[PDB]
Structure 1
Amino acid sequence: ELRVGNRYRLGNKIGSGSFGDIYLGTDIAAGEEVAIKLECVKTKHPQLHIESKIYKMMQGGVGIPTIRWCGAEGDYNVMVMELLGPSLEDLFNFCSRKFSLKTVLLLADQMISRIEYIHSKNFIHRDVKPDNFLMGLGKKGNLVYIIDFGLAKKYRDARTHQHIPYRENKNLTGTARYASINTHLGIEQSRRDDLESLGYVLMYFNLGSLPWQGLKAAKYERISEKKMSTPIEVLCKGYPSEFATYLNFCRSLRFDDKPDYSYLRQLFRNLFHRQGFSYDYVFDWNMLKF
């Protein structure tokens, strides 16, 4: 039996993010379960406590995870979060690596809103990918949450909204597979870049796998080159134009531009209602007991 904070019982690993590791535990007092991020204190570069503050700044936003309790305790900084349903990668695999157009558009609509909300509290996420989107439990079950603000950062000053400066020679940050063209080239990341990664997440959900996925070297140069060489028209072939239009828009944004988040959603909701779907949140994984 393992206790943290003198009120939580620590169970088993249920996750691994960018830093730390996530486990199941129980609020012994409340009588209800939780996610418990742990980072060991003898890491070269501490992070949980910074991330913890990013969560308190996002709190009370649609599909932003609730933080129950934060603090350091012996050898582990710890962060108790509301427990959440499974990730879109988990669901994607449960659905055998293929989602209907309906599920990809219900998700697209929520994914763009969480990204927009982060951008309005002055942060970029920088690792938009299937694992960092999660469905809530029970009441909040048709609601995509966003997680892992471990690589996120301020892109503009909280007071003046002055954008961060443009620069170059940045290292890779974020998952190679879904990075922006610009990140592959070493350009400082901005809002455009978060939404362009969503773009690849959406095509990944349609294709089953991107075409720069599953190459085999002995660096990641290769990924970069085929992502940059793939004409959008060819990546999106056999899928609605709206997916090429979203990505061309994002690829066409400028470093400090405010993306038009209403327009990008609009592509998708208009495609949605033109196909004859009903906005009932029946997803592809709907026969589960969330």
Structure 2
Amino acid sequence: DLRVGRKFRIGRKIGSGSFGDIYHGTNLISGEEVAIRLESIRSRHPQLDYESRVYKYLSGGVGIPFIRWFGREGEYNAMVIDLLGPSLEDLFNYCHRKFSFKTVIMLALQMICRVQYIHGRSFIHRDIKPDNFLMGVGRRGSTVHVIDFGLSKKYRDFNTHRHIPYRENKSLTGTARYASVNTHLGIEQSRRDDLESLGYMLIYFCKGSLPWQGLKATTKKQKYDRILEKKLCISVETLCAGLPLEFSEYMNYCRNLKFDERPDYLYLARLFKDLSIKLEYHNDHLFDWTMLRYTKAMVEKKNDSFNKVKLLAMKKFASHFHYCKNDDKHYPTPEEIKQQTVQNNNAAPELLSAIDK
């Protein structure tokens, strides 16, 4: 309950982590709810100061949490920033670990823009994963935000745009579930790698998992290298089985980019915009969790309970909920996928009547 940056009061924890804790905070003058991150100054590997400085440099971008204050408060490095909502991994779990094509397409459109803005500010993220994308709170709940810039890096000179040099034998640090093949190989990360990681997330979201998940090994390196072998040896076709051709096209593009090459962000956005048209989706910010949450509220006026809610939701929103069929070996046609609209309507008392109201 101490004060930070004169006017920010620390409240309840949100909260804990490896680089410190994150708290609810309040601006004592305006009453605005914010987020406050703390890092012990006795930390052996300080990261908060770095992140705050990246956040400052990125300040003003759409979907970049807006830093309000950072500095020193006694025994703590502190950072005051926008309060955000659930992560996409959180929402993935809420939806029982599968997203519709529509929701994945809509996330992809926003996330490509976020990554584009970050690259436009001469930084690469280097830690692209579902946990690092959060929705806004309240009415900002339709905007995907990017967080966690502790591993981010300048990939080019601010004035000359001279790219950092090519390099090998770089070490790998985290879970490498979403890491690019070239990261695994020890190559200096560049813009392409952020986008490849984004690609794996999309496939993850669609299919419910990646085929190199849940591996065990005797050492970290062995595990990393087992993941690398699967990424390398499983074809893009197999990887993207059951998904419209855009998803494998997205992946082939990222894997084919050269080290210092500027990505064609608009080409990639057009992939998913064109697909949403073929699938007759509106870009209406109506995500799976939005509609499941609404449906549930009306019903209430645990695995088995969810399935009933989901059934009603898919009936009321038949044209919105299309899913990958993981037994598929091919890329389904748009008309193939849209056939699920009919199936959704054909599913089945007073409860079906209640929801319309």
TM range (shorter): over 0.9
- 8 A contact 2:19–2:46 mirrored in 1: no
| 1:166-204 deviation per Cα after TM superposition (whole angstroms, max 9, x unaligned) | 010001145310000000010000000000000001001
SS of the aligned residue for 1:286 comes to helix
Q: Which residue of 2 aligns with 1:11?
A: 11
SS of the aligned residue for 1:51 comes to helix
Q: Which residue of 2 aligns with 1:172?
A: 172
Distance 1:126 1:17 in 2: 19
Distance 2:184 2:274 in 1: 32
Q: Which residue of 2 aligns with 1:282?
A: 286
Distance 1:188 1:17 in 2: 27
Query: How do residues 212-227 of structure 1 correspond to structure 2 at under 5 angstroms?
Result: 212-219=212-219, 220=223, 221-227=225-231
| 1:217-271 deviation per Cα after TM superposition (whole angstroms, max 9, x unaligned) | 2332322222222111101001111110001100000000001000011111000
Asked whether 1:117 is paired with 2:121, we answer: no
Q: Which residue of 2 aligns with 1:83?
A: 83
| 1:21-63 deviation per Cα after TM superposition (whole angstroms, max 9, x unaligned) | 3222222222121111111111222221121111111111111
- Residue ranges of structure 2 left out of the alignment (5+ in a row): 295-357
Amino acid in the other structure paired with 1:86: P
* TM-score when normalising by structure 1: 0.95
Shift in Å at residue 18 of structure 1?
6.6
- 8 A contact 1:122–1:154 mirrored in 2: yes
| 1:122-170 deviation per Cα after TM superposition (whole angstroms, max 9, x unaligned) | 0000001101101112232211010111000000001110000001000
SS of the aligned residue for 1:197 comes to helix
Shift in Å at residue 19 of structure 1?
3.0
Q: Which residue of 1 aligns with 2:65?
A: 65
Higher mean C-alpha deviation, range 26-35 or range 183-192 = 26-35
Query: How do residues 83-162 of structure 1 correspond to structure 2 at under 5 angstroms?
Result: 83-162=83-162
Q: Which residue of 1 aligns with 2:300?
A: none
Amino acid in the other structure paired with 1:39: E
Pick from 249, 260, 268 the counterpart of residue 245 of structure 1. Answer: 249
Higher mean C-alpha deviation, range 166-175 or range 112-121 = 166-175
Shift in Å at residue 76 of structure 1?
1.0
Higher mean C-alpha deviation, range 136-145 or range 261-270 = 136-145
Q: Which residue of 2 aligns with 1:257?
A: 261
- 8 A contact 2:52–2:70 mirrored in 1: yes
- Residue ranges of structure 1 left out of the alignment (5+ in a row): none
Distance 1:227 1:15 in 2: 34
Structure 1 residues 108 and 16: CA distance shift in structure 2, 3 A: farther
- 8 A contact 1:126–1:173 mirrored in 2: no
Distance 1:21 1:230 in 2: 39
Distance 2:5 2:59 in 1: 21
Shift in Å at residue 16 of structure 1?
5.1
Distance 1:57 1:75 in 2: 25
Distance 1:185 1:248 in 2: 18
Amino acid in the other structure paired with 2:200: Y
Q: Which residue of 2 aligns with 1:196?
A: 196
* TM-score when normalising by structure 2: 0.78
How many residue pairs match? The answer is 289
Pick from 230, 235, 248 the counterpart of residue 234 of structure 2. Answer: 230
SS of the aligned residue for 2:288 comes to coil
Structure 1 residues 11 and 228: CA distance shift in structure 2, 3 A: farther
Amino acid in the other structure paired with 1:29: I
Shift in Å at residue 10 of structure 1?
2.0
Whose Rg is larger? 2
Distance 2:216 2:193 in 1: 26
- 8 A contact 1:127–1:152 mirrored in 2: yes
Distance 1:266 1:26 in 2: 41
SS of the aligned residue for 2:290 comes to coil
Distance 1:229 1:189 in 2: 21
Higher mean C-alpha deviation, range 227-236 or range 194-203 = 227-236
Distance 2:94 2:134 in 1: 14
SS of the aligned residue for 1:178 comes to coil
Distance 1:198 1:15 in 2: 26
Distance 1:39 1:273 in 2: 46
SS of the aligned residue for 1:12 comes to strand
Q: Which residue of 2 aligns with 1:26?
A: 26
| 1:68-87 deviation per Cα after TM superposition (whole angstroms, max 9, x unaligned) | 11111111100011101111
Cα RMSD after superposing both structures:
1.5
